Amino acid sequence: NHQVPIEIRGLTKHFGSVRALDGLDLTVREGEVHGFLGPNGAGKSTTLRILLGLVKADGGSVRLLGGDPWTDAVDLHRHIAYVPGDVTLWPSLTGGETIDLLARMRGGIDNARRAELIERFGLDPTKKARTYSKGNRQKVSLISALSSHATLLLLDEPSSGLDPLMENVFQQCIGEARQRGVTVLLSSHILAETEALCEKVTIIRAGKTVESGSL
Amino acid sequence: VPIEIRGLTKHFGSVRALDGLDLTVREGEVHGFLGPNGAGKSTTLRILLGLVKADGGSVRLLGGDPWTDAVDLHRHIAYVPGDVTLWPSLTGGETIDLLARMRGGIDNARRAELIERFGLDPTKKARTYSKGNRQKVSLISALSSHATLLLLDEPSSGLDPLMENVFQQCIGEARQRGVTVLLSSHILAETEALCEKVTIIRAGKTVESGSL
Amino acid sequence: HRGSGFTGTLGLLRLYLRRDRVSLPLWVLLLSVPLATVYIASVETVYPDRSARAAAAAAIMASPAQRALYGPVYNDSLGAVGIWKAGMFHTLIAVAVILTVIRHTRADEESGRAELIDSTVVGRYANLTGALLLSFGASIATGAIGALGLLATDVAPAGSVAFGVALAASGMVFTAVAAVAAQLSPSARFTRAVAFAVLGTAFALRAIGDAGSGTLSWCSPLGWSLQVRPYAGERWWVLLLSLATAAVLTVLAYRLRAGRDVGAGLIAERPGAGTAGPMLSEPFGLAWRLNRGSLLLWTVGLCLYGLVMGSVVHGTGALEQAFLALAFTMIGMVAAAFAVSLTLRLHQEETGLRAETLLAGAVSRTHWLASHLAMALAGSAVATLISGVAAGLAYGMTVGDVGGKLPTVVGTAAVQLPAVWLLSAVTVGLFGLAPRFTPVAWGVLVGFIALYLLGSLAGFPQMLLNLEPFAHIPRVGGGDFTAVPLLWLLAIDAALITLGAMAFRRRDVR
Numbered sequence: 001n002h003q004v005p006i007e008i009r010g011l012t013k014h015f016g017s018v019r020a021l022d023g024l025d026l027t028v029r030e031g032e033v034h035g036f037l038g039p040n041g042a043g044k045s046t047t048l049r050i051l052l053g054l055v056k057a058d059g060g061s062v063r064l065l066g067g068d069p070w071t072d073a074v075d076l077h078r079h080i081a082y083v084p085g086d087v088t089l090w091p092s093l094t095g096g097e098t099i100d101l102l103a104r105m106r107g108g109i110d111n112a113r114r115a116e117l118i119e120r121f122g123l124d125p126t127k128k129a130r131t132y133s134k135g136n137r138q139k140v141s142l143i144s145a146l147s148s149h150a151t152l153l154l155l156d157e158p159s160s161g162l163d164p165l166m167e168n169v170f171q172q173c174i175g176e177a178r179q180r181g182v183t184v185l186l187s188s189h190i191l192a193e194t195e196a197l198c199e200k201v202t203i204i205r206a207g208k209t210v211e212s213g214s215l
Numbered sequence: 216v217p218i219e220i221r222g223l224t225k226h227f228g229s230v231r232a233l234d235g236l237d238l239t240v241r242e243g244e245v246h247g248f249l250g251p252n253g254a255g256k257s258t259t260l261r262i263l264l265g266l267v268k269a270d271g272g273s274v275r276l277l278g279g280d281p282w283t284d285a286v287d288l289h290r291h292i293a294y295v296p297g298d299v300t301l302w303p304s305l306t307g308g309e310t311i312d313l314l315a316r317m318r319g320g321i322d323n324a325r326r327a328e329l330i331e332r333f334g335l336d337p338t339k340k341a342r343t344y345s346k347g348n349r350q351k352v353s354l355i356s357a358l359s360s361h362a363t364l365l366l367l368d369e370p371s372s373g374l375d376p377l378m379e380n381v382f383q384q385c386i387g388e389a390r391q392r393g394v395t396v397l398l399s400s401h402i403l404a405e406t407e408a409l410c411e412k413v414t415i416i417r418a419g420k421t422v423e424s425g426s427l
Numbered sequence: 428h429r430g431s432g433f434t435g436t437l438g439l440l441r442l443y444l445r446r447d448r449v450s451l452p453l454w455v456l457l458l459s460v461p462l463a464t465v466y467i468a469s470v471e472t473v474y475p476d477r478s479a480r481a482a483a484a485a486a487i488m489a490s491p492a493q494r495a496l497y498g499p500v501y502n503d504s505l506g507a508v509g510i511w512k513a514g515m516f517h518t519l520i521a522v523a524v525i526l527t528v529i530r531h532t533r534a535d536e537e538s539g540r541a542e543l544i545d546s547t548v549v550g551r552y553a554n555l556t557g558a559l560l561l562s563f564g565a566s567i568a569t570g571a572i573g574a575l576g577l578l579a580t581d582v583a584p585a586g587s588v589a590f591g592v593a594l595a596a597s598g599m600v601f602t603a604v605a606a607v608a609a610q611l612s613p614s615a616r617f618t619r620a621v622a623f624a625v626l627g628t629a630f631a632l633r634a635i636g637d638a639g640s641g642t643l644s645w646c647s648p649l650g651w652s653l654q655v656r657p658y659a660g661e662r663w664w665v666l667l668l669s670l671a672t673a674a675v676l677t678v679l680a681y682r683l684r685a686g687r688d689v690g691a692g693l694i695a696e697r698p699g700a701g702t703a704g705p706m707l708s709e710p711f712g713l714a715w716r717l718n719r720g721s722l723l724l725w726t727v728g729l730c731l732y733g734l735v736m737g738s739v740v741h742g743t744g745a746l747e748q749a750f751l752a753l754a755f756t757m758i759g760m761v762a763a764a765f766a767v768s769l770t771l772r773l774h775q776e777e778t779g780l781r782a783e784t785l786l787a788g789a790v791s792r793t794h795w796l797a798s799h800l801a802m803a804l805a806g807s808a809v810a811t812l813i814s815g816v817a818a819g820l821a822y823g824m825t826v827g828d829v830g831g832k833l834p835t836v837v838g839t840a841a842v843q844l845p846a847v848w849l850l851s852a853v854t855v856g857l858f859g860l861a862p863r864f865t866p867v868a869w870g871v872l873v874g875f876i877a878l879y880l881l882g883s884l885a886g887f888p889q890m891l892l893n894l895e896p897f898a899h900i901p902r903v904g905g906g907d908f909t910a911v912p913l914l915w916l917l918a919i920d921a922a923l924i925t926l927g928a929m930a931f932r933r934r935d936v937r
């Protein structure tokens with residue numbers, strides 16, 4: 001993968017008359033937590049939908065893990081874990097069943113980490129998924145993504161709805177994931193977890209890159 | 216005393232969602248409402264709107280019961296949910312106009328001011344809004360009404376720092392003209408700036424309460 | 428001041444009214460206009476001399492099979508014989524009103540609109556009252572239009588009013604049922620299944636009563652409409668029954684509402700399992716887990732219907748053939764609706780933001796699609812074959828042998844599959860080219876059903892009735908079997924499916 005998990009050059013996409021992206025650039029470099037900052041309407045989620053192959057790009061080059069995101073979106077997706085901006089679960093499945101189900105279509109779950117993640121996020125894994133408050137509904141995705149085989153994490157506002165302590169447990173989990181050579185791309189609006197976790201911030205404004213570099 | 220919860224209690228199945236609560240908000244002040252992810256903060260705000268029907272205790276919202284007097288009280292009250300869902304077909308301006316028609320009143324001189332200040336584009340289908348402009352619809356539809364009591368569950372979620380600053384200034388201006396606010400945050404940085412007299416509940420009961 | 432629980436009813440009613448403004452007029456006209464322009468208009472051509480009409484009546488009262496589907500004929504007047512065939516319109520209106528009430532009450536309330544609406548100055552009962560007013564208005568308008576159309580013909584004018592009022596009451600009785608069912612569960616599909624189980628039971632009781640003495644047809648809201656007896660001596664007081672059952676139930680639908688909370692039902696929820704089993708590790712396992720109850724309920728219902736229809740076939744093999752081939756077409760239509768819903772599981776999955784969660788993994792777009800497609804193609808086939816087997820066993824026992832009557836009835840059920848799968852193919856083709864317009868497969872199916880019912884009866888040319896699959900199905904038994912149209916109906920299906928698949932891999936999941 002040329003030791004560069006992500007490499008975007010001149011990305012472009014229009015949604016009709018709306019120019020969502022107009023020349024975005026990125027480069028994540030095998031081992032670092034990368035901050036993906038920008039205003040509302042910048043094009044942060046859309047980029048995360050282009051790396052996953054859900055959406056096709058009108059121009060430029062994208063090289064995810066050394067391959068094409070659009071045509072190779074099955075063998076590259078078993079090295080990747082994804083946390084969406086809007087977390088939606090199946091209302092009939094249990095909380096502990098969704099973790100196992102989601103982690104099984106990726107590279108696979110790790111039962112040593114799963115138990116200690118459920119232990120310290122304080123989740124109740126025997127409870128239907130339509131009774132989770134906005135905060136135990138995010139712990140399901142966080143535990144499912146942080147206990148899996150993944151050499152790249154694409155987190156999209158992963159601490160939305162977490163009280164000051166469950167979002168300090170998450171920082172420790174990310175810090176100890178970075179120790180074993182895991183690459184993280186972190187999109188967020190809280191510039192208090194970005195300072196503590198991330199170096200190499202990257203700020204985009206209207207689909208274009210306006211700032212980049214180490215903190 | 217707009218809110219005088221004195222002993223609330225709620226069971227859903229065998230789950231003790233609320234086990235004796237003592238919230239008390241007074242006139243013309245911003246009140247914080249904090250707690251971990253099991254406390255019962257979103258349930259309490261649903262009990263005050265007459266949507267959950269608490270199993271015990273006393274609730275005197277604006278001097279009347281929330282369950283049997285809901286329609287009469289809800290013309291002084293605005294609500295911003297933690298999970299904002301709109302109509303995908305309608306437009307942002309159309310949604311605000313429709314919600315103003317149901318509430319039976321709006322302030323257009325403030326509606327225009329908020330629309331041109333939050334940066335909302337009021338001519339776009341609501342299904343194209345990027346989770347930060349979806350919260351602006353609720354914020355504008357609630358801050359531009361005639362309500363004298365606002366209940367905000369998580370008003371600034373998905374908002375970049377500039378828009379969160381704008382929201383803070385808007386809440387300050389609202390508090391200037393004698394408006395009462397009850398705010399659930401999980402963000403102890405806007406709670407410290409906006410409001411005094413926080414209230415913390417851990418397992419469905421109040422643990423501490425008082426001036427900051 | 429001046430507030431009650433019914434505030435906001437008119438506003439909610441009008442924003443329900445404008446939501447379905449291309450659907451409500453269409454079916455309101457479809458269930459009322461073709462009563463004087465088709466059924467009564469095409470009785471002076473088929474049955475001219477009155478001496479002939481009487482003969483037709485003597486051929487209905489001497490066959491329980493024909494009067495199980497439609498009901499008895501009590502005299503040889505032009506109106507009675509002409510409108511005998513239109514006794515099926517008392518079930519379609521019930522289906523329509525049930526769907527409308529559930530759609531506007533519980534489907535929205537499951538999408539979070541209840542919180543947004545009720546946080547305003549909108550009463551507690553406004554949402555219920557708006558849907559009830561809409562359904563009552565629709566069911567009264569269809570009856571009024573039908574009566575006005577029938578009053579312009581040369582039939583007796585009293586029976587026309589009686590039929591119109593009976594048609595209105597049949598749809599007013601099954602609106603309270605839909606409301607009471609909607610007050611029950613937090614899931615919309617469970618409420619729809621509960622509402623339709625009552626209608627199925629009522630139809631089965633009505634059929635068993637009609638095909639026999641007639642005592643058992645007094646225990647069902649359907650069959651309270653045929654005993655009004657338009658054109659054959661009107662019993663007016665029977666409508667009072669349909670006015671009490673609607674009033675008693677609709678009060679309950681309010682008493683069940685003044686004690687639930689927005690979002691819940693009547694029974695709290697139970698804990699599940701904290702670990703997934705060895706079956707829920709795949710899109711195939713996930714799709715199976717979501718459709719177990721629907722598959723079981725549809726299978727049981729179709730088996731019971733086949734068991735009921737097979738007993739009346741023999742209370743001369745040139746009439747049991749014609750009745751079995753006519754009775755299994757209805758089963759084919761019901762299984763087609765089953766397939767359409769099991770495939771719309773896919774549109775509901777994507778529009779709920781849960782498709783991007785699955786597709787952001789080592790799942791392909793064709794392996795995900797062919798996990799709901801494989802359930803729609805298999806559940807309908809299993810249900811249809813089980814219904815055919817049950818009908819064959821029931822028919823064989825009442826005749827004397829089973830091994831000579833089972834294979835033919837199984838073949839009759841199995842030759843309906845190419846027409847059933849065509850609607851799954853249409854839904855898959857629509858989901859992949861125009862995903863937003865996926866739910867017009869319902870309109871396509873209703874158009875096919877309407878064409879089949881009102882085709883060779885209003886004089887359409889036999890090149891316009893060829894645009895539907897239910898007319899091309901062969902006839903098993905004796906000769907007349909070709910097996911060519913099936914080969915033309917399978918191929919089409921494959922093509923459509925392929926098209927949809929090829930149009931899904933090159934698209935945006937946005």
Ligand SMILES: Nc1ncnc2c1ncn2[C@@H]1O[C@H](COP(=O)(O)OP(=O)(O)NP(=O)(O)O)[C@@H](O)[C@H]1O
Pocket residue numbers: 015018020038039040041042043044045046047085343344345346347348373937
């Ligand atoms: N389906 C769509 N059709 C049209 N415009 C769209 C669509 N999806 C997104 N957009 C627009 O594309 C732009 C980029 O939005 P988006 O990619 O969601 O950025 P964003 O960073 O996620 N917003 P936010 O999450 O608040 O920071 C916005 O102007 C959207 O309104």
Ligand SMILES: Nc1ncnc2c1ncn2[C@@H]1O[C@H](COP(=O)(O)OP(=O)(O)NP(=O)(O)O)[C@@H](O)[C@H]1O
Pocket residue numbers: 130131132133134135136161227228230232251252253254255256257258259
């Ligand atoms: N409909 C329901 N059925 C059963 N249990 C429920 C239901 N709604 C909420 N609960 C439970 O009741 C408790 C209170 O939830 P809730 O008040 O929503 O949390 P919260 O105060 O909002 N904290 P947060 O997750 O940050 O929003 C939790 O244990 C929920 O799981």
Ligand SMILES: [Mg+2]
Pocket residue numbers: 044045085345346
């Ligand atoms: Mg976003």
Ligand SMILES: [Mg+2]
Pocket residue numbers: 133134256257297
């Ligand atoms: Mg909450």
